[model samples]
Target chain A: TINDDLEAINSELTSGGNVVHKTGDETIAGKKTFTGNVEVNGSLTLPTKSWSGELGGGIILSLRKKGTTVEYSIGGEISSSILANSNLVNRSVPNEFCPRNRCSLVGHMVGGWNAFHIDIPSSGVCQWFGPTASSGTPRGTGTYPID
Target chain B: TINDDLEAINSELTSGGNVVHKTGDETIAGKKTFTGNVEVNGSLTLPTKSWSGELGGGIILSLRKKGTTVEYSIGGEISSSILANSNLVNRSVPNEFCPRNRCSLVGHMVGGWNAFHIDIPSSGVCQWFGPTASSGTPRGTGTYPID
Candidate 1:
């Protein structure tokens, strides 16, 4: 019905989506864009949002890879967007061990199922640092004013 | 008046407009309530956020299609406001070649673009083993130790 729901989310962002790196690859995973041209293995640009002036605006995704061939599109407000500063917001840890893996959810049952990941990363200090600089730890953002 | 900027953002949570996704629809995504609703169609959920030393902690979104939809919200700390995990964060990559894509973006690309998918499920072996059990990485959540 809506083309069978955009073919079940463009077949879930092309297939097995969302950033899960350490070379597990979202093609290296990082970039931005939104309002909804949601693409993920075409070249990382996260564009999903729900904002309410907790502080100003949101929406940015910029990229350009060569041989492996990755290109991108941008968003609204200004030059559009392409900003970073990295670290943290990454994850894996689920070979299993409910002894207290985040204390049950079937003990971080990643392979068996029940997986979840949310990121805006950095904490390895950019891992090596480049593409812009200063990454990770925006779980609250450069700032989140409102109440 | 752009409807007055869509009624100043659907009144910021219903009545005017943005798109928060309490399934209040954003009003069928066409437009209204369940507070600042946001939706991205391929299993993306904002479910409202902002942070602080506010709780023991919060940030849980689990969904395995029909039988799993555990959600927890609230972000930031010491007055909480969850901006985004932080730094160089944005994702997308389905220019189509995903022989398998990880990857990830959007605006109203949701319905007009019409997408559909919701999977917080897996089954590889992140499914199991011993303690110290291959638990490799991805830690740094909610409050990230205090915004």
Candidate 2:
């Protein structure tokens, strides 16, 4: 019954409790509630328009009305460390602690997750000052490149 | 030929070039290259651990190595604006510009993408001091809430 198996697969995709598969890239055109844990082995390229979600605890990450920008923030945290500017390639920069609390940068600026450097202070509270016109140091002054 | 369709589905789930399905939450246990534009009606949650990707432009977004933190960055940008403190609900907050070029924060702080506000300045150079112990203003002098 080829039709029987086809119906089963279709039912699993449409109304089943969960659809489990290990397959190639797929396009989901409908709404789905993923109650299970998700693991992405590749980059999850978001639509060029709108999308939103909750991260770790209470952090909000979204591409709201302006699809061109990505905004994120936390309650009581601060941006702490920065990667050396020399390490940046083709204008792509790695992740570092925010210099401030809440952050919203242009979505086009995001590269990909890569290992960079951070100068962890003796206090273990890593904070950073982005490339600015002027500055002081909380983790002891050196040449802290921010841009 | 139930066996025939079952084999076809199984083959599609494994060695197929692409999969198209509309269904429940499923786990992907293999690597995939999505050469398509993605539209997420809901949040695309990542694993509790390692993952990385290129966001808009050259900006990078990742939960690499330490699953406890999320990091992102762009070149030639600064944290420019902040929403009113009264708008925040529970412990969650919305997105704003990164105070510095690159940003890395504890992942647990992220809530999700949502509509928030930013006070666009007359100068159009929206920079913020975050919730710092000290401060100054590039746009003007006002009680800019950072926390």
Best by DockQ: 2
Worst 10 residues of 1 chain A by lDDT: A97-106
What is every candidate's C-alpha DockQ against the true complex, given to 2 decimals?
Answer: 0.02, 0.07
DockQ of 2: 0.07
Query: Quality of candidate 1's docking, in CAPRI categories?
Result: incorrect
lDDT of 2 by residue, B121-143 (tens): 22223222122211111111111
lDDT of 2 at A24: 36
- List where candidate 2 sits over 4 angstroms from the true fold: A1-21, A24-147, B1-20, B49-147
lDDT, candidate 2, at A139: 11
Q: RMSD for each model, in Å, please?
A: 23.5, 17.8
Q: What TM-score do all the candidates reach, one by one?
A: 0.15, 0.24
